[PDB]
Amino acid sequence: SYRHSFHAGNHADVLKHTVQSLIIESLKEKDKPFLYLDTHAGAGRYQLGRTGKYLEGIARIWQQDDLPAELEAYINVVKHFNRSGQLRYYPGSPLIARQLLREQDSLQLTELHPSDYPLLRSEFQKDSRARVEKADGFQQLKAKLPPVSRRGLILIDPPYEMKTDYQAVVSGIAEGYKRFATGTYALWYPVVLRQQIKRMIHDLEATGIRKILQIELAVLPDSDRRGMTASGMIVINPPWKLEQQMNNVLPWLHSKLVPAGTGHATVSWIVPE
Ligand SMILES: Nc1ncnc2c1ncn2[C@@H]1O[C@@H](CN(CCCNc2ncnc3c2ncn3[C@H]2O[C@@H](CO)[C@@H](O)[C@H]2O)CC[C@H](N)C(=O)O)[C@@H](O)[C@H]1O
């Protein structure tokens, strides 16, 4: 039976999966196959619920009739999994990739958690494009790159339960980048303590890697006491349209996700070309 999740479809999920969908839609503009690599893939999909963070996330987005055209692909995948019109299922990143990728493209998904891996495996049991491995995700940035197709989106989306996640993401990014330097790397991060993020970003600059874009949506100002008040996406080699797309949808997302106007929503270069 599909996993229940209290956090699935929260504002962080809306931003991450928005960005994942747009990157994927950009890579589909060329006929040649690409790889979708998901270092930390989770269960695949989530049974929702009135409680659950989704009420303040995807529920405030998916039935809006002023949807910016940039969200259509993402929201269309959510609708696919809730055809009766009642918000009951949220697709994880592997399923957004499963629905958006074409016949020719490939998926490589790892999940270590023994409760989620078997669910994740059955989601691709009949999909000859996809492989699912019970492996450490960070190790995949060495073992699976470059893809044979030499095109790809790599999503690095660890739990950040262990504070070492903030260093592993960066060294893993540098490991994969040396091997596949034209790939698009998307790193999801949460803002719990802002000092954590300043250090991680400083470590990313220290690698010298170029073309690093930062997309961050905050539902409250930085705090010392309130858990995750913001999340972001850091994109190495973003498709050329991504920055203008995010400038278009980010204020909209913030408007609908945070009526009170707390927090912020920003697109900026950590490191330009
Ligand atoms: N706290 C959570 N617990 C369980 N599920 C959660 C939680 N937060 C979000 N999710 C949902 O699974 C998420 C990710 N997914 C698998 C679940 C990974 N396991 C987690 N373990 C402990 N803490 C987690 C976890 N995930 C986020 N946190 C965070 O807790 C934050 C506040 O929220 C921060 O402090 C941070 O520590 C990856 C699948 C794939 N890459 C995809 O994109 O789906 C995410 O997508 C969301 O849907």
3-state secondary structure the chain: CCEECCCCCCHHHHHHHHHHHHHHHHHCCCCCCCEEEECCCCCCEEECCCCCHHHHCHHHCCCCCCCCHHHHHHHHHHHHCCCCCCCCEEECHHHHHHHHCCCCCEEEEECCCCCCHHHHHHCCCCCCCEEEECCCHHHHHHHCCCCCCCCEEEEECCCCCCCCHHHHHHHHHHHHHHHCCCCEEEEEEEECCHHHHHHHHHHHHHCCCCCEEEEEEECCCCCCCCCCCEEEEEEECCCCCHHHHHHHHHHHHHHHHCCCCCCEEEEEEEECC
Cβ-contact 156, 39 below 8 angstroms: yes
Domain count of the fold of the chain: 1
Residue owning the nearest CA to atom 18 of ligand 1: 159
Q: How far apart are CA 210 and CA 24, in angstroms?
A: 21
Q: Which residues pair with 215 in a beta bridge?
A: 233, 267
Q: How far apart are CA 226 and CA 131, in angstroms?
A: 38
Q: Which residues pair with 271 in a beta bridge?
A: 212
Experimentally determined by: X-ray
Phi, psi of 265 (to 5 degrees): -155, 120
Cβ-contact 152, 26 below 8 angstroms: no
Cα 257 to the chain's mean position, in Å?
17
CA distances from 159 to 15, 112, 166 (A): 16, 11, 10
Q: How far apart are CA 156 and CA 128, in angstroms?
A: 23
Q: How far apart are CA 111 and CA 100, in angstroms?
A: 20
Please indicate whether residue 157 is annotated as part of the active site. yes
Cβ-contact 237, 184 below 8 angstroms: yes
Q: Name the packing angle between helices 11-27 and 72-80 (round to 10°).
A: 110
Q: List the structure tokens of 107.
A: 């998926």
Binding site membership of 172 for ligand 1 (Cβ less than 6 Å): no
Sheet of strand 264-271: strand arrangement: 130-133, 106-110, 35-38, 152-156, 184-191, 230-236, 212-218, 264-271
Domain that includes residue 71, residue range:
1-273
Binding site membership of 40 for ligand 1 (Cβ less than 6 Å): yes
CA distances from 234 to 72, 154, 159, 211 (A): 22, 12, 16, 10
Binding site membership of 204 for ligand 1 (Cβ less than 6 Å): no
Angle at 229 between CA 22 and CA 88, to 5 degrees: 60
Q: How far apart are CA 128 and CA 32, in angstroms?
A: 17
Q: What is the CA radius of gyration of the chain?
A: 17
Q: Which residues of 21-55 are buried (b: 16+ CB within 10 A; e: fewer)?
A: bbbbbbbeeeeebbbbbbbbbbbbbbebeeebbbe
Q: Which of 190, 191, 195, 122 is nearest to 158 (CA)?
A: 190
Distance 10 CA to ligand 1 centre (A): 10
- We report the CATH number of the domain holding residue 28 as 3.40.50.150
Q: Which of 31, 269, 34 is nearest to 153 (CA)?
A: 34
The amino acid present at 23, given as its one-letter code, is: I
CB-CB neighbours of 92 under 10 Å: 28
Q: Which of 185, 193, 203, 266 is nearest to 224 (CA)?
A: 193
| Data resolution in angstroms | 2.1
Binding site membership of 159 for ligand 1 (Cβ less than 6 Å): yes
CA distances from 244 to 17, 81, 171, 266 (A): 17, 29, 28, 12
